[PDB]
């Protein structure tokens, strides 16, 4: 409608119409808002829009319209600046400078338009990046001169310098060439003397808070790069550590500055600097105690209350204390007079560590780790911290975390282990007394008994065995009495679970005490019949956990037992597992397999194996008699469930037994592969009778589960198999015949990606021994899988991922299979690799680039023969340009390192004459021409057509540097990154590629 008038550039811009459009976007809603958003996006994306920018900054009254005008200018300055005439560059600089001075003069504008001023400064800083100091030598002297007059201008100049420092030192790595980064860094460094002198004066004279805070904001940025002398050889530490900690506006920023001061590069052999480092900490801690809160203050409650900036401040104090003490605590440890300072700083940390905030606790926990590690190893240091360490034990224990929160739990366990070593008596007491307050009921809750159990379990192995024995006994007795005390099966279950959690954590105790171990296990079996939520899983999870640790005690004959306990478990296995769900039964069988692997007498292992597998083998034998006698019985979904569960039981036992599972695999193998075929036929029959929809039905998904678990069982055995002659001679031929054709000849939606996964493992372990088999795998899976996945990057995601894993391992182990491909199929192989390059999916991209690299190595390895020479003529420049395409398109940045490596390998081949033919065809270049000269020619041309805004000089220099540097990978990478910056702008300096 009327709003689209601003997109007509043939007339003057109606500024009132712009402000309609802009207001409608920011303060409007719905359909109106969306339409205005598209109009502003098209206005801004107009390549001529910057010309109408000075008009908007003068005549518009709407600050959002002006902000957008600066974004249009910003776009021009970063990307097309060097293309402008020199009068336009001076003109644009002048009205950006003019506007900034004008807005600082007007106090009302300066107070109320901070966002528009800050954007103007950032736009000014983009000009400095282009023009300073070579075309603006006087910027800094003239910045300092304007600062003396107006306080508002002085404050704004600190904002400009802060942004400059950020853009040159903190954010230059990605956005500039190395040469330009260095130039701007040297230029800031070269005139920093004058800049600091101004900052220090402002800090000492110190009138306006907003000026002081902005100056401290800028100082924070300087501390990232400036040399230590400016901090230690002036009086600025006294100001930061005393003056600016007292007032709360400056306190926040000053504390962050002192944190960064604690990270400066400092000479380590100088007493005066050591005293100064002690002093600013002393001053800082003194101001906290007198201006903010004393050592005794409840910081948990303060943080929880969340007043004003209290949470941010407490976070920053934690950061300050931890940072400084990690570096400097040794300075406070030998002097008697610094002892109180040392312990108070640590007492603040104890209080900060009680705060209920996960991420803060992690910050402080990293420091406690650093400390207690040092007290464990550093001589004569633990006696200092005895009282801090005692409090820390309560803190860690009360905040213990479920082992499920992986990272947090490890960090906590490690610290609590170190603290248990440092004082074992104190650790025991705290745990026992915390446990007493569960029995008396003062600290009692489900969460509280859980946390203490996790804590008690974390320190297993740290005590002497004799102490551990008394400790464990006391804890289990108390927990047993706690369970008897409680009423209602909700309560009893929580404690029983924690009882069993703790015993699981102490395998050394279980190993030494057989009677007790047996009782625990028989008790877990009683719990496998409890229906109450969670109990059966806990019983099974505990069983396999105890077994992984205590294997050997189940497999030998214990004194005063008639048999090894594994035999007693197997006998009652039906009765023991009768109430468990299928997946719980499988954990149980897997547990038994761990034990059976300990028996190293072969006759006895195999005897236990077939005893363990007795129930599923008898279920199996009957189902094979039923389903082969008539395929009708397999239509029943109850029979499908039972079959899948027999196979999963085998997968579970094979998982823990690996190579030992072979005799069991042999019992079922041939009938199992016949089952694969019968099932395959039903799946194809349903899909023909119902359509593609069939593959979603519970019936067909049940049948596919059988195929997948069968493939999983064979993959699992082959992955761990020690006898590879049997794998080839006995397993492989039947497997390939059962699976390959079925996969090939089903419609895409009925193909199992697990076929590909299974074949990957087969090629991995025995590919070297079955060249004809690997060929057969490719014929059956390659072209049909490629056609499923070469239309988009989304469909058949599992097949996509397994496909490139299969090709990867084929290319490593049995490369000769690709040589046997007809040239047209070899071309699809190259197409497929390059197709992988263009994926965003990391599983595919990484394998794509790896296959490319290993293929090049494989071809190099062949030496000077026809196949290698016909490969380079056909595919070398395909690989060079396809690798270049994904380096430079901005959509595959995640693959940069592997792209660079492949590109380097491709360039080195030509630079070392490892390609023994003309890469050019007849009549395209002179006859004596080396591949090196033709590589430079082709690349120049390629890049010229792909990036036509680059000069011939830019491209020639980039390639000249790139080929010189094709041995040094990190430098090569730098040159590529320089090129990725230059392609985003016009007029990049070709000399930048001489950076060294």
């Amino acid at each position: 409608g009327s709003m689209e008038g601003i997109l007509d550039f043939s007339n003057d811009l109606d500024i009132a119409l712009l402000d309609q459009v802009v207001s409608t976007f920011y303060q409007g809603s719905g359909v109106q808002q969306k339409q205005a958003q598209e109009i502003l996006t098209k206005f801004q994306d107009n390549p001529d829009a910057w010309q109408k920018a000075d008009q908007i900054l003068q005549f518009s009254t709407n600050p959002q319209s002006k902000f957008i005008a600066l974004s249009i200018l910003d776009k021009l300055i970063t990307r097309k600046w060097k293309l402008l005439p020199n009068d336009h560059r001076i003109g644009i600089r002048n009205f950006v400078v003019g506007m900034i001075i004008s807005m600082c003069q007007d106090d009302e504008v300066f107070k109320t338009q901070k966002n528009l001023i800050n954007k103007s400064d950032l736009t000014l800083v983009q000009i400095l990046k282009q023009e300073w100091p070579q075309n603006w030598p006087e910027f800094i002297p003239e910045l300092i001169g304007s600062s003396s007059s107006s306080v508002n201008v002085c404050e704004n100049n600190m904002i400009v310098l802060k942004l400059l420092s950020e853009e040159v030192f903190d954010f230059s790595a990605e956005q500039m060439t190395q040469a330009k980064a260095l130039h701007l860094k040297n230029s800031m460094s070269k005139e920093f003397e004058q800049i600091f002198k101004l900052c220090f004066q402002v800090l000492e004279q110190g009138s306006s808070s907003s000026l002081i805070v902005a100056t401290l904001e800028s100082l924070l940025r300087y501390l990232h790069w400036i040399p230590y002398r400016y901090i230690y050889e002036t009086n600025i530490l006294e100001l930061l550590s005393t003056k600016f900690m007292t007032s709360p506006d400056t306190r926040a920023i000053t504390l962050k500055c002192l944190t960064e001061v604690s990270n400066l590069k400092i000479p380590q052999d100088n007493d005066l600097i050591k005293r100064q480092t002690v002093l600013f900490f002393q001053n800082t801690l003194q101001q906290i105690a007198t201006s903010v809160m004393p050592v005794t203050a409840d910081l948990k409650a303060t943080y929880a209350n969340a007043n004003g900036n209290d949470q941010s401040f407490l976070q920053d104090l934690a950061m300050f204390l931890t940072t400084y003490l990690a570096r400097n605590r040794a300075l406070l440890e030998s002097d008697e007079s610094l002892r109180e300072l040392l312990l108070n700083a640590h007492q603040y940390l104890i209080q900060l560590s009680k705060i209920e905030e996960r991420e803060l606790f992690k910050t402080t926990l990293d420091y406690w780790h650093n400390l207690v590690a040092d007290l464990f190893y550093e001589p004569l240091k633990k006696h200092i911290y005895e009282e801090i360490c005692s409090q820390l034990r309560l803190v860690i224990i009360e905040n213990m975390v479920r082992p499920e929160e992986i990272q947090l739990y490890k960090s906590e366990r490690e610290v609590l282990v170190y603290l248990t070593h440092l004082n074992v008596i104190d650790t025991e007491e705290i745990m026992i007394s915390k446990l007493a307050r569960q029995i008396d009921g003062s600290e009692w809750s489900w969460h509280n008994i859980n946390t203490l159990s996790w804590a008690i379990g974390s320190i297993s192995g740290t005590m002497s065995e004799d102490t551990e024995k008394r400790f464990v006994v006391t804890v289990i007795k108390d927990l047993l009495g706690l369970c008897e005390q409680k009423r209602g099966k909700d309560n009893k279950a929580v404690v029983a679970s924690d009882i069993m959690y703790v015993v699981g954590q102490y395998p050394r105790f279980l190993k030494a005490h057989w009677n007790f171990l047996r009782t625990v296990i028989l008790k877990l079996f009683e719990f496998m019949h409890e229906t109450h939520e969670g109990v059966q899983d806990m019983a099974c999870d505990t069983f396999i956990k105890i077994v992984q640790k205590c294997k050997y005690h189940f497999v030998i004959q214990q004194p005063r037992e008639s048999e090894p306990f594994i035999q007693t478990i197997i006998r009652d296995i039906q009765k023991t597992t009768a109430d468990l769900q299928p997946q719980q039964v499988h954990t149980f069988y897997k547990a038994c397999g761990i034990i059976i692997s300990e028996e190293r007498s072969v006759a006895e292992r195999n005897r236990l194996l077939s005893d363990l597998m007795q129930l599923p083998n008898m279920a199996w034998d009957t189902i094979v008699e039923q389903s082969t006698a008539n395929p009708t019985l397999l239509l029943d979904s109850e029979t499908v469930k039972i079959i899948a569960n027999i196979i999963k039981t085998n997968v579970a036992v094979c998982t823990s037994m690996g190579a030992d599972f072979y005799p069991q695999l042999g019992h079922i193998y041939y009938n199992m592969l016949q089952l694969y075929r019968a099932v395959s036929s039903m799946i194809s029959a349903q899909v023909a009778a119902e359509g593609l929809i069939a593959t979603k039905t519970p019936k067909v998904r049940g049948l596919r589960t059988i195929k997948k678990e069968i493939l999983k069982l064979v993959e699992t055995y082959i992955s761990k198999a020690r006898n590879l002659d049997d794998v080839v001679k006995v397993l492989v031929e039947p497997l390939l015949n059962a699976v390959l054709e079925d996969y090939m000849n089903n419609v895409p939606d009925a193909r199992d990606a697990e076929v590909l996964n299974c074949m990957t493992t087969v090629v991995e372990k025995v590919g070297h021994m079955i060249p004809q088999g690997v060929i057969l795998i490719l014929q059956s899976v390659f072209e049909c899988t490629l056609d499923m996945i070469n239309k988009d990057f989304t469909e058949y995601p599992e097949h996509r991922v397994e496909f490139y894993k299969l090709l990867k391992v084929i290319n490593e182990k049995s490369f000769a299979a690709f040589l046997e491909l007809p040239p047209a199929a070899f071309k699809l192989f190259v197409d497929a690799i390059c197709w992988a390059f263009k994926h965003n999916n990391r599983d595919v991209e990484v394998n794509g680039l790896q296959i490319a690299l290993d293929l090049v190595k494989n071809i190099e390895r062949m030496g000077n023969v026809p196949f290698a020479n016909e490969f380079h003529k056909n595919y070398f420049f395909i690989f060079v340009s396809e690798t270049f395409f994904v380096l430079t398109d901005s959509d595959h940045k995640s693959g940069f390192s592997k792209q660079a490596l492949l590109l380097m390998k491709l360039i080195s081949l030509v630079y070392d004459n490892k390609i023994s033919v003309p890469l050019y065809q007849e009549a395209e270049v002179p006859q004596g021409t080396s591949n090196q000269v033709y590589l430079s020619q082709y690349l120049a041309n390629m890049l010229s057509n792909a990036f036509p805004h680059l000069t011939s000089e830019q491209i020639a220099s980039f390639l000249s540097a790139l080929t010189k540097q094709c041995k040094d990978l990190v430098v090569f990478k730098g040159t590529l990154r320089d090129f990725l910056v230059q392609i985003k702008e016009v007029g990049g300096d070709p000399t930048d590629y001489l950076f060294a």
């Binding site: 007795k477 047993l480 009423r487 099966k489 009893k492 005490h513 009677n515 009782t519």
Partner: peptide
Amino acid sequence: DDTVDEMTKKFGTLTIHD
């Protein structure tokens, strides 16, 4: 040993029911 046996017997009577 002595204390461990006392503990083992108490373990055997652990229950979820009253």
